[PDB]
Write a protein that binds this ligand. Structure first.
Ligand SMILES: *[C@@H]1O[C@H](CO)[C@@H](O[C@@H]2O[C@H](CO)[C@@H](O[C@@H]3O[C@H](CO[C@H]4O[C@H](CO)[C@@H](O)[C@H](O)[C@@H]4O[C@@H]4O[C@H](CO)[C@@H](O[C@@H]5O[C@H](CO)[C@H](O)[C@H](O)[C@H]5O)[C@H](O)[C@H]4NC(C)=O)[C@@H](O)[C@H](O[C@H]4O[C@H](CO)[C@@H](O)[C@H](O)[C@@H]4O[C@@H]4O[C@H](CO)[C@@H](O)[C@H](O)[C@H]4NC(C)=O)[C@@H]3O)[C@H](O)[C@H]2NC(C)=O)[C@H](O)[C@H]1NC(C)=O
Ligand SMILES: *[C@@H]1O[C@H](CO)[C@@H](O[C@@H]2O[C@H](CO)[C@@H](O[C@@H]3O[C@H](CO[C@H]4O[C@H](CO)[C@@H](O)[C@H](O)[C@@H]4O[C@@H]4O[C@H](CO)[C@@H](O[C@@H]5O[C@H](CO)[C@H](O)[C@H](O)[C@H]5O)[C@H](O)[C@H]4NC(C)=O)[C@@H](O)[C@H](O[C@H]4O[C@H](CO)[C@@H](O)[C@H](O)[C@@H]4O[C@@H]4O[C@H](CO)[C@@H](O)[C@H](O)[C@H]4NC(C)=O)[C@@H]3O)[C@H](O)[C@H]2NC(C)=O)[C@H](O)[C@H]1NC(C)=O
Ligand SMILES: *[C@@H]1O[C@H](CO)[C@@H](O[C@@H]2O[C@H](CO)[C@@H](O)[C@H](O)[C@H]2NC(C)=O)[C@H](O)[C@H]1NC(C)=O
Ligand SMILES: *[C@@H]1O[C@H](CO)[C@@H](O[C@@H]2O[C@H](CO)[C@@H](O)[C@H](O)[C@H]2NC(C)=O)[C@H](O)[C@H]1NC(C)=O
Ligand SMILES: C[C@@H]1O[C@@H](O)[C@@H](O)[C@H](O)[C@@H]1O
Ligand SMILES: C[C@@H]1O[C@@H](O)[C@@H](O)[C@H](O)[C@@H]1O
Lengths: 205, 205
């Protein structure tokens, strides 16, 4: 018996449109009694609105999931979520808790950065978005142009900087021509320390 | 009994000045007979120049190390290194092998990138070095100025790009003044696909 507790995605907690969930995975439950109940605890008080997914025999044992929709404000305010798993004839229930990382939240700085001169000898070129000074590391970055989402972009993991804040870069790739004929590209950042959790910074020739 | 086999550091294999080593860690050896011999195999042929570190009782069992100096060309040419561990009364020796990642090596592109205009409102500023298009991901990046190594720099892990090559950024932090009063900063890259495994690209106001 091993129990794994997963947090919601940042984007899910930052946009009120989306639905943030905490999922409780239990695996390696002996096929003897694969009957298991879930007790969910939000900051002490128990809650009872957790969908519990139908058990599924893994090829090797059973694995089952309990899903709990969370309130955007609760998670961001730092309430602990507690997953108590109960199994008939199991010495004691297992308890796993989760909460958003603790620490002074801190607003990210977003600078857009055009390609180098030496890079203009290719047919693709690199538009850079630097995002730094933020805390916690949970963040979301996307490129777009003319309100259309962009594609050839990859974003580094957050890296821990020397002041305890985090930074990342995001690299967008567009053909020299798209950038050459003017054209405005745009780096989007989602983070709990921004106003309305969101910022645009743009970049053109 | 568990055996862990570790590769040399990139910088060790790329500079002939340095000494690249492959280390064989074996842990969880029952304290009954903590006597264990090592057999080293380079691309089939056995070698016999591996220093073997004196066994050490872990607080919990024994852990012992065998260190093998490697030839820069051997590792880069892709020879497999094989660690055969022998223990008296152990059902069969354990075999672990290691070699440099396979795949067409590919030369990194290095572009230096000055700060954004909007970043000039601070007293620190960010000088960026983008390194992309390289394969394998083993690489080494450092900043300097006037042949003096620099400091406030952090470098992202390599990220897998859409063409199968890798890229990273490296961010150096200097006070606005150092950058303002001219001054030339310099990003260094070490990689097996560069000539003499090394490149400088510079950056000034
Ligand atoms: C029989 O066969 C079984 C399968 O059929 C097999 O079950 C596996 O057991 C493994 C061993 O226990 C277990 O391994 C763990 O996996 C953890 C990661 O799991 C995610 O990523 C995998 C890919 O890498 C996926 O395959 C998983 O399904 C899982 O995927 C995540 O799933 C969640 C839930 O659905 C999902 O969240 C929700 O997503 C939706 C969208 O769909 C929304 O976004 C919701 O908002 C969101 O809530 C995730 O998005 C999804 N992510 C991904 C990437 O897919 C892995 O992290 C575990 O590592 C832990 O343990 C080791 C050992 O200590 C630590 O080194 C490690 O750091 C982790 O634990 C640390 O513990 C520390 C304390 O000691 C603590 O301080 C640390 O904080 C903590 N770590 C961290 C990072 O904080 C572990 O590897 C595997 O998941 C099981 N597979 C399945 C399918 O269940 C079983 O074992 C077999 N049995 C036998 C006997 O053979
Ligand atoms: C009793 O107490 C014992 C300790 O006293 C304890 O021993 C520990 O056991 C652990 C469990 O087995 C074991 O955990 C492994 O650790 C691996 C990483 O170890 C490095 O990093 C640790 C910090 O994160 C350090 O503490 C380690 O010492 C080790 O540090 C590295 O050391 C080497 C050798 O010295 C060094 O190389 C040399 O350095 C010099 C400079 O000094 C030069 O540069 C040389 O050129 C160079 O050669 C490294 O630089 C140094 N690095 C660092 C960062 O410190 C960890 O990677 C292991 O993970 C593997 O297993 C899991 C499980 O499957 C996988 O998820 C994981 O990906 C790894 O295995 C994968 O296997 C796949 C196949 O299934 C394969 O496809 C993958 O390729 C492969 N993974 C990868 C990434 O490719 C694992 O966590 C720990 O090291 C032991 N500690 C010690 C001190 O030995 C023992 O367990 C206890 N016993 C009991 C019963 O309680
Ligand atoms: C799963 O549970 C069953 C039942 O608890 C285990 O089978 C028992 O194993 C013990 C240990 O020798 C025996 O004394 C019992 O007589 C067994 N009973 C039955 C009904 O099989 C089984 O080994 C467990 N398997 C795992 C992987 O945990
Ligand atoms: C380490 O090895 C010793 C000896 O092989 C183990 O002790 C033996 O355990 C078996 C299993 O019950 C007994 O039948 C033997 O009589 C024991 N002999 C001695 C000398 O103790 C010991 O359990 C092993 N420990 C670990 C963690 O592997
Ligand atoms: C090792 C595990 O075996 C089974 C699969 O359903 C899991 O995803 C995993 O591969
Ligand atoms: C769990 C292991 O216990 C002992 C130490 O020497 C190791 O480094 C590790 O902490």
């Amino acid at each position: 018996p091993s129990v794994f507790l997963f947090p919601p995605k940042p984007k899910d907690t930052l946009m009120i449109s989306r639905t943030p969930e905490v999922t409780c995975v239990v695996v390696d439950v002996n096929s003897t009694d694969p009957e298991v109940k879930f007790n969910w605890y939000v900051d002490g008080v128990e809650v009872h609105n957790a969908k519990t997914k139908p058990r599924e025999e893994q090829y090797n044992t059973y694995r089952v999931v309990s899903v709990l929709t969370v309130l955007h404000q609760d998670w961001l305010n730092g309430k602990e979520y507690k997953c108590k798993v109960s199994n008939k004839a199991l010495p004691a229930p297992i308890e796993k808790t989760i909460s958003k990382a603790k620490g002074q939240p801190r607003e990210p700085q977003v600078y857009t950065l055009p390609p180098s001169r030496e890079e203009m000898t290719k047919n693709q070129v690199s538009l850079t978005c630097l995002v730094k000074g933020f805390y916690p590391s949970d963040i979301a970055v996307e490129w777009e142009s003319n309100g259309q989402p962009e594609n050839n972009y990859k974003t580094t993991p957050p890296v821990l900087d020397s002041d305890g804040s985090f930074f990342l870069y995001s690299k967008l790739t567009v053909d020299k021509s798209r950038w050459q004929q003017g054209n405005v590209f745009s780096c989007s950042v989602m983070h709990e320390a921004l106003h309305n959790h969101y910022t645009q910074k743009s970049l053109s020739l």
